[PDB]
């Protein structure tokens, strides 16, 4: 079965670049605009820059490195011709069909599996790769959430802290690049904070990411919450976790546990560095979570860990990983 | 007749602030959001900061310094009850009804005059205060345009150059803050350059402002064109005019003519400074066009003149001026 | 005694604006540049905009609303003739004389008191207004630190939490506007993080501000630390405090304690809001610490509190308050 | 002769990356900081991102892919040990030795050639590659200037216009990313405009780049001037040239002449595109000047041409080209 993308946006386009680079063929791309515009946005990217290959188009297809990909502008997911293009797995990256009752419309068009690139409601399962991907059951799990970028940044760290030390409870903040949910200048929005000019403000906004970590690490249920602060950067984020552990530790012990995890069982998901880096250094990093070791603090059993993540590229790599897992399992 | 605003956006809200400060009663504000949100946006502004007064609201009204203003969320302009609010002049600042055939819908609800806060299609006349406001005729002109921010920046300077020296031809660029037409991150847009992340790019885009200037100053027909470059600032712009004149001049002579106009016949429209200023210094300046004298260059008959403008506040002051003209004329 | 300023920078100039508005006479301003430049920088400010008054200069003086202020460019503080200008209290805001042994150079020129506008080493006392200003002893305390902007944001909140609930320990992060210590583009710096382009990065950096809060609240000694994240905003910051308290609390109780303190004993120092604000809304706020009530979280005895602060204007208001206290006490 | 770099800054480091990729050996790098910092700044770049190879250091050397490069911190050019490292060609990229009298100090350290990466005074020749590099005479030209980034953007376009149509005179503006000469927040500067916060302003500033174009195209002497507007982008610029030609032309003819030159005699120096691009699309482009064809305008004999350039990477490629020319000539 082939792969399809609904919503060729920031996440959809990076997921495409990654799948394409891995040889996983996407057969249909659907959005709301014409193919000239889809091609143009793929070709030129303000963050990741020129597509490393050839991009062309006509009224029916995008042509990427000589490969024809059907490309359409069908607003209602029930009407997307997935079956005709041979698509069995749909990446749902529009942002408007995160309710499973709406995302299931892709099955009417002949899809077998939908991966929602966001927190969902009513999904069969939420997966964070490296943390609970072994819980995926291909016979029962058809509408699947890959969680949020922030949850993917948190869960690997929290898994390590729980397994090495035990976690009584924790709170976090993510200091996070702006995204297309926000506003360029002050403008009506359902969230009166996100209404405000994004590139000249620090903007507090509610996040379900810490609560949602309990979906993949049930030990955190009812004892993990947090906040987001959106700041004037275009991609790249950092999670600042303050945890109360079940024993007293040093910063060095916390770092050693995270390093061991990054080099071993969580390799490719969790990364670890002791370099004095900044945001631009993690742009286009494929990891979910990049521990910045020099920032770790400990006051007995109370610790502070920082983990960077490129909220576009890192997360998109996880969507691609999940697509490959779903394909592997049938 | 009372005044009404359709589109309580960046321009609509600043025009409201200005009219309120002048004692001009706005009796109805219409947008697409609830009154909590309208009140919030008025109260807290990322550029002009806290509204100088009390703002409150309920389901039917905004309350500003005690005074009740009907506040609604009616998507179709034909259905706004301007008549019941006593509104005769509508400020059309949504950005989606710049075609006079659509803006005329306000007359169905009982308005007598519509001021479109943008370049228009099919309007009765386009007015630039200080340049052709005497052409406004209340017996002929009912749907009128106040032109663009850029046209209002250019026309006062071009008037002076034409009258003092004569203009053979001219080209211009405006280096211009981003606006809400643009995108925060790369996203589909009808204009493939405006599709791109606004706060991390210089973005070329087409402008009709020079051609529009050549109509309010008709002697320049076919002799004036230009371009815009959108850059990462939140408000404030500068026009860079290169003109071939009908004789040799000096920079000093050009500056003297502009200063004379600013101090006399174009006072309140054209300003003049010799200070070494930058963008932040012209934020909330009420002028249409602010000549930066130290930037003026001349090579014989070829000159270069720079004029700043706050594309929100300055333009909003001109809308308010046009509103007061229209009210005065009946 | 009259007041002098050494270092007419971001803090020095705002302190001047504030003292001038309060009628406190500044008799000498010293920097490294000429009076034309000092006058220009006071007149035009990229954040606080046009100085509300007339500014002029000559080779020996700045003139503010017609009042002459001696203005010089003397690099060695031992050579500034404070006593000749009648100056007894020096505001030391250069950033390079925060070691008390260096700040004492002002005493050679006849000053009696030096207020270092930063954390210091070897000072007689560090004061945070509203927290320990009553500890000031005019007979013995001559070299005084007003602490950092961040310490001033933290100490009022920590005082309230200790007094209402008891604080076992705490960690914090400040998400903080860039400052002139940082680099516009990647450039050598003693801090490899601060070496990096400030306006296109989130930049972690060490802060002593939580540890230094123990200077004014000794109960926190060995029990409070944190981190800074510098982000692309030009002024305005927020402190994110995670505290372990001595009993279980609700977010409502934490907010009520902070509101009571803001409305009572800490009025003018600590503020409290329930509005959904963003950074631009706290620019030019005079408070040290502005609790954002809707962001408060509690999980049993672990709480999370956010306090905004304008790192320039708020802090400058505290410097001015301390200046007035020192003058009052003799 | 081997190559040396004095001033391992924005230009110095990119020139290093480019020479390294070309297999041109750099044998000494001098700056004002320690080798840890030089290695760190090479390794991690906020624009061009991770150095594509291994970087290490000790007290005496940097190591790039295992190759040892002497690395020192000698403030006085006369004292740099160029002779011991076998260096015959010094890239002078500190910004403080653009006067040939000071730059000549490298020759008494054993160097034979100095390429000043900026406009110079007293130099033996100023070269813009593609325009007058054939004038380089190795027997007489010791101290060589590679001109400014802006001059390199202008001269290729002006050469084409003169040769195809004839140029009577011209004026230009460059809309230009901020650079390390500028200030992060308002701070004293010799240039009162450049004193101002760079990332929240449009900042007009003088440029000698159009006048300096006459050094390589003498027909433009006294007939070409312009201005710069510094805007909040971290690299990437665009030149906006308004030229009066010696006959009437269309935009199509102008574009055809620029395309022919880009595809033929000026290949690798001048590029030509008809794509609808923005600043991020030209970051890390190696060309001096990239014509944006869709922006070209003509009114009779008055034309307007826009040419993009990465002021770091493009210019650094020209420094590398000139180094290779100087090496080839002996
Ligand atoms: N950007 C991030 O950092 C990030 C990270 C992880 C997850 N996500 C989630 O991924 C989803 C997409 O986010 P994004 O940032 O890529 O958004 P985006 O706004 O950049 O892209 C959304 C795309 O969906 C298209 N679209 C909207 N409605 C459609 C419809 N009915 N049919 C087809 N196409 C439609 C839009 O035209 C646009 O191209 C959201 O759920 C978001 O929460 C975003
Ligand atoms: N921002 C500037 O610099 C500037 C300057 C001069 C002119 N203008 C023009 O003014 C107009 C408004 O621009 P803006 O920047 O304020 O835009 P904006 O996007 O900030 O505001 C538009 C407002 O219109 C509302 N709206 C949209 N559709 C509506 C509808 N059908 N009914 C009622 N309300 C609706 C939106 O909710 C929003 O609040 C545009 O035509 C723009 O081109 C803008
Ligand atoms: N900016 C903030 O947010 C902030 C807040 C609280 C405290 N502070 C502290 O206040 C001090 C100043 O900070 P700033 O942001 O105003 O810095 P700044 O760089 O804006 O200003 C420093 C001023 O001192 C002048 N100066 C330097 N050396 C001098 C000397 N030898 N003699 C006279 N003048 C000299 C400089 O020319 C400049 O005008 C620092 O200690 C800083 O840590 C800053
Ligand atoms: N950045 C651009 O866009 C650009 C483009 C073309 C030319 N230039 C020119 O290249 C030169 C460097 O510009 P930049 O942007 O790389 O500047 P930069 O400030 O980034 O780098 C300058 C480097 O020189 C070092 N330095 C200063 N004095 C020194 C000394 N005495 N000895 C050794 N090293 C010293 C500094 O430590 C720094 O690392 C300037 O002349 C500039 O005008 C810059």
Short mmCIF file of N, CA, C and O and ligand atoms in Angstrom, two decimals, chain C residues 6-13 30-33 38 41 72-77 80 92-98 116-119 147-150 176-181 230 235 237 309-313 315-316 319, chain D residues 185-188, ligand 3:
data_model
loop_
_atom_site.label_atom_id
_atom_site.label_comp_id
_atom_site.label_asym_id
_atom_site.label_seq_id
_atom_site.Cartn_x
_atom_site.Cartn_y
_atom_site.Cartn_z
N UNK C 6 26.89 57.33 35.71
CA UNK C 6 28.03 56.83 34.96
C UNK C 6 27.57 55.65 34.12
O UNK C 6 27.21 54.61 34.66
N UNK C 7 27.58 55.82 32.81
CA UNK C 7 27.03 54.83 31.90
C UNK C 7 25.63 55.21 31.49
O UNK C 7 24.67 54.80 32.12
N UNK C 8 25.53 56.02 30.44
CA UNK C 8 24.25 56.52 29.93
C UNK C 8 23.73 55.56 28.86
O UNK C 8 23.51 55.95 27.71
N UNK C 9 23.51 54.31 29.26
CA UNK C 9 23.12 53.25 28.35
C UNK C 9 21.63 52.99 28.44
O UNK C 9 20.85 53.89 28.72
N UNK C 10 21.23 51.75 28.21
CA UNK C 10 19.81 51.43 28.28
C UNK C 10 19.25 51.75 29.66
O UNK C 10 18.25 52.44 29.77
N UNK C 11 19.92 51.26 30.70
CA UNK C 11 19.47 51.54 32.06
C UNK C 11 19.73 52.99 32.45
O UNK C 11 18.85 53.65 32.96
N UNK C 12 20.93 53.50 32.23
CA UNK C 12 21.23 54.87 32.59
C UNK C 12 20.25 55.89 32.00
O UNK C 12 19.83 56.82 32.68
N UNK C 13 19.87 55.71 30.74
CA UNK C 13 18.96 56.66 30.10
C UNK C 13 17.53 56.54 30.62
O UNK C 13 16.87 57.56 30.82
N UNK C 30 28.11 60.85 32.65
CA UNK C 30 29.39 60.48 32.08
C UNK C 30 29.23 59.22 31.24
O UNK C 30 28.50 58.31 31.63
N UNK C 31 29.90 59.19 30.10
CA UNK C 31 29.91 58.04 29.21
C UNK C 31 31.24 57.99 28.44
O UNK C 31 32.25 58.49 28.94
N UNK C 32 31.27 57.38 27.26
CA UNK C 32 32.47 57.31 26.43
C UNK C 32 32.32 58.03 25.10
O UNK C 32 33.24 58.02 24.27
N UNK C 33 31.18 58.69 24.91
CA UNK C 33 30.86 59.31 23.63
C UNK C 33 30.60 60.80 23.81
O UNK C 33 30.59 61.32 24.93
N UNK C 38 25.01 61.52 23.06
CA UNK C 38 24.21 61.35 24.27
C UNK C 38 22.84 61.99 24.11
O UNK C 38 21.82 61.40 24.47
N UNK C 41 20.65 59.90 21.59
CA UNK C 41 20.18 58.65 22.18
C UNK C 41 19.08 58.90 23.20
O UNK C 41 18.17 58.11 23.31
N UNK C 72 30.17 64.45 30.14
CA UNK C 72 31.58 64.20 29.88
C UNK C 72 31.83 62.79 29.36
O UNK C 72 30.93 61.94 29.36
N UNK C 73 33.07 62.55 28.93
CA UNK C 73 33.48 61.26 28.40
C UNK C 73 34.81 60.82 29.03
O UNK C 73 35.84 60.74 28.37
N UNK C 74 34.75 60.49 30.32
CA UNK C 74 35.93 60.18 31.13
C UNK C 74 35.91 58.69 31.42
O UNK C 74 35.02 58.20 32.12
N UNK C 75 36.87 57.96 30.86
CA UNK C 75 36.85 56.49 30.91
C UNK C 75 37.21 55.93 32.29
O UNK C 75 36.74 54.88 32.66
N UNK C 76 38.06 56.64 33.03
CA UNK C 76 38.50 56.20 34.34
C UNK C 76 37.64 56.88 35.41
O UNK C 76 37.72 58.10 35.57
N UNK C 77 36.83 56.12 36.14
CA UNK C 77 35.93 56.72 37.13
C UNK C 77 36.62 57.51 38.24
O UNK C 77 36.00 58.41 38.80
N UNK C 80 36.44 61.31 37.31
CA UNK C 80 35.19 62.07 37.16
C UNK C 80 35.07 63.00 38.37
O UNK C 80 35.14 62.53 39.50
N UNK C 92 25.91 53.79 38.99
CA UNK C 92 26.97 53.12 38.24
C UNK C 92 26.35 52.07 37.33
O UNK C 92 26.07 50.94 37.74
N UNK C 93 26.11 52.49 36.09
CA UNK C 93 25.38 51.72 35.10
C UNK C 93 26.18 51.52 33.81
O UNK C 93 25.60 51.37 32.74
N UNK C 94 27.52 51.43 33.91
CA UNK C 94 28.35 51.13 32.73
C UNK C 94 28.42 49.64 32.43
O UNK C 94 28.67 49.25 31.29
N UNK C 95 28.27 48.83 33.47
CA UNK C 95 28.41 47.39 33.36
C UNK C 95 29.81 46.88 33.59
O UNK C 95 30.01 45.66 33.61
N UNK C 96 30.78 47.77 33.74
CA UNK C 96 32.19 47.37 33.85
C UNK C 96 32.83 47.65 35.22
O UNK C 96 33.99 47.31 35.44
N UNK C 97 32.08 48.26 36.14
CA UNK C 97 32.57 48.56 37.49
C UNK C 97 31.65 47.98 38.57
O UNK C 97 31.31 48.66 39.54
N UNK C 98 31.28 46.72 38.39
CA UNK C 98 30.39 46.03 39.34
C UNK C 98 31.16 45.37 40.48
O UNK C 98 30.57 44.99 41.47
N UNK C 116 25.25 50.48 42.27
CA UNK C 116 25.61 49.65 41.15
C UNK C 116 24.34 49.00 40.62
O UNK C 116 23.65 48.31 41.37
N UNK C 117 24.06 49.18 39.34
CA UNK C 117 22.79 48.75 38.75
C UNK C 117 22.89 47.33 38.21
O UNK C 117 22.51 47.03 37.08
N UNK C 118 23.40 46.44 39.05
CA UNK C 118 23.72 45.08 38.66
C UNK C 118 24.12 44.32 39.90
O UNK C 118 24.46 44.94 40.91
N UNK C 119 24.16 42.99 39.83
CA UNK C 119 24.83 42.21 40.86
C UNK C 119 26.27 42.68 40.99
O UNK C 119 26.90 43.03 39.98
N UNK C 147 20.86 44.76 42.70
CA UNK C 147 20.65 43.42 42.16
C UNK C 147 20.39 43.45 40.64
O UNK C 147 20.57 44.47 39.98
N UNK C 148 20.01 42.31 40.08
CA UNK C 148 19.65 42.22 38.68
C UNK C 148 18.15 42.42 38.46
O UNK C 148 17.36 42.37 39.41
N UNK C 149 17.77 42.67 37.20
CA UNK C 149 16.37 42.72 36.80
C UNK C 149 15.68 41.43 37.18
O UNK C 149 14.60 41.45 37.74
N UNK C 150 16.31 40.29 36.93
CA UNK C 150 15.69 39.02 37.23
C UNK C 150 15.52 38.80 38.73
O UNK C 150 14.48 38.33 39.16
N UNK C 176 13.93 35.78 28.46
CA UNK C 176 14.42 37.14 28.67
C UNK C 176 14.77 37.76 27.33
O UNK C 176 15.36 37.10 26.48
N UNK C 177 14.40 39.01 27.14
CA UNK C 177 14.80 39.76 25.95
C UNK C 177 16.32 39.83 25.86
O UNK C 177 17.03 39.80 26.88
N UNK C 178 16.84 39.94 24.65
CA UNK C 178 18.28 40.13 24.49
C UNK C 178 18.70 41.50 25.04
O UNK C 178 17.89 42.41 25.19
N UNK C 179 19.98 41.60 25.40
CA UNK C 179 20.54 42.84 25.93
C UNK C 179 21.86 43.14 25.25
O UNK C 179 22.36 42.33 24.47
N UNK C 180 22.45 44.28 25.57
CA UNK C 180 23.66 44.74 24.89
C UNK C 180 24.93 43.94 25.21
O UNK C 180 25.96 44.17 24.59
N UNK C 181 24.84 43.01 26.16
CA UNK C 181 25.93 42.07 26.40
C UNK C 181 26.06 41.06 25.26
O UNK C 181 27.13 40.48 25.04
N UNK C 230 17.65 33.52 26.52
CA UNK C 230 17.54 34.79 25.82
C UNK C 230 16.87 34.56 24.46
O UNK C 230 17.27 33.69 23.71
N UNK C 235 12.96 44.17 24.58
CA UNK C 235 12.83 44.33 26.03
C UNK C 235 11.55 43.66 26.50
O UNK C 235 10.59 43.52 25.74
N UNK C 237 10.60 40.54 29.75
CA UNK C 237 11.04 39.22 30.16
C UNK C 237 9.97 38.60 31.04
O UNK C 237 9.04 39.27 31.47
N UNK C 309 8.21 41.09 33.62
CA UNK C 309 8.91 42.30 34.01
C UNK C 309 9.53 42.94 32.79
O UNK C 309 10.11 42.26 31.95
N UNK C 310 9.44 44.27 32.72
CA UNK C 310 10.20 44.99 31.73
C UNK C 310 11.60 45.19 32.33
O UNK C 310 11.82 45.99 33.23
N UNK C 311 12.54 44.40 31.82
CA UNK C 311 13.90 44.40 32.34
C UNK C 311 14.60 45.76 32.27
O UNK C 311 15.53 45.99 33.03
N UNK C 312 14.17 46.64 31.37
CA UNK C 312 14.66 48.02 31.36
C UNK C 312 13.82 48.91 32.28
O UNK C 312 14.29 49.34 33.33
N UNK C 313 12.58 49.17 31.91
CA UNK C 313 11.78 50.19 32.60
C UNK C 313 11.46 49.85 34.05
O UNK C 313 11.53 50.72 34.92
N UNK C 315 13.08 47.80 36.13
CA UNK C 315 14.32 47.88 36.88
C UNK C 315 14.78 49.32 37.08
O UNK C 315 15.23 49.69 38.16
N UNK C 316 14.66 50.14 36.04
CA UNK C 316 15.07 51.53 36.14
C UNK C 316 14.23 52.25 37.19
O UNK C 316 14.74 53.10 37.90
N UNK C 319 15.80 51.39 40.47
CA UNK C 319 17.01 52.19 40.69
C UNK C 319 16.60 53.58 41.18
O UNK C 319 17.18 54.09 42.14
N UNK D 185 20.97 46.74 20.47
CA UNK D 185 20.04 47.72 21.04
C UNK D 185 20.68 49.09 20.92
O UNK D 185 21.88 49.20 20.67
N UNK D 186 19.89 50.15 21.09
CA UNK D 186 20.42 51.50 20.95
C UNK D 186 21.67 51.69 21.82
O UNK D 186 21.62 51.50 23.03
N UNK D 187 22.77 52.09 21.18
CA UNK D 187 24.07 52.19 21.83
C UNK D 187 24.91 53.20 21.06
O UNK D 187 24.75 53.32 19.86
N UNK D 188 25.83 53.92 21.69
CA UNK D 188 26.67 54.86 20.94
C UNK D 188 27.34 54.22 19.72
O UNK D 188 27.77 53.08 19.75
N1 LIG E 3 19.47 46.08 30.13
C1 LIG E 3 18.89 45.41 31.12
O1 LIG E 3 17.91 44.68 30.97
C2 LIG E 3 19.52 45.54 32.49
C3 LIG E 3 18.70 45.36 33.60
C4 LIG E 3 19.23 45.46 34.88
C5 LIG E 3 20.58 45.74 35.04
N2 LIG E 3 21.41 45.91 33.93
C6 LIG E 3 22.83 46.22 34.18
O2 LIG E 3 23.01 47.63 34.03
C7 LIG E 3 24.35 47.85 33.51
C8 LIG E 3 24.19 48.56 32.17
O3 LIG E 3 23.40 47.75 31.27
P1 LIG E 3 22.86 48.38 29.91
O4 LIG E 3 21.96 47.34 29.33
O5 LIG E 3 22.36 49.74 30.15
O6 LIG E 3 24.23 48.44 29.04
P2 LIG E 3 24.57 49.32 27.74
O7 LIG E 3 25.65 48.58 27.04
O8 LIG E 3 23.32 49.70 27.06
O9 LIG E 3 25.12 50.67 28.33
C9 LIG E 3 26.41 50.78 28.93
C10 LIG E 3 26.84 52.24 28.81
O10 LIG E 3 28.05 52.41 29.59
C11 LIG E 3 28.97 53.16 28.81
N3 LIG E 3 30.33 52.83 29.30
C12 LIG E 3 31.04 51.70 29.14
N4 LIG E 3 32.22 51.84 29.76
C13 LIG E 3 32.26 53.05 30.32
C14 LIG E 3 33.19 53.76 31.09
N5 LIG E 3 34.38 53.25 31.41
N6 LIG E 3 32.87 55.00 31.50
C15 LIG E 3 31.71 55.55 31.19
N7 LIG E 3 30.80 54.91 30.47
C16 LIG E 3 31.05 53.67 30.02
C17 LIG E 3 28.73 52.65 27.39
O11 LIG E 3 29.22 53.58 26.42
C18 LIG E 3 27.19 52.56 27.35
O12 LIG E 3 26.58 53.82 26.97
C19 LIG E 3 24.98 46.47 33.39
O13 LIG E 3 25.65 46.17 34.63
C20 LIG E 3 23.78 45.57 33.19
O14 LIG E 3 24.07 44.24 33.64
C21 LIG E 3 20.88 45.81 32.65
#
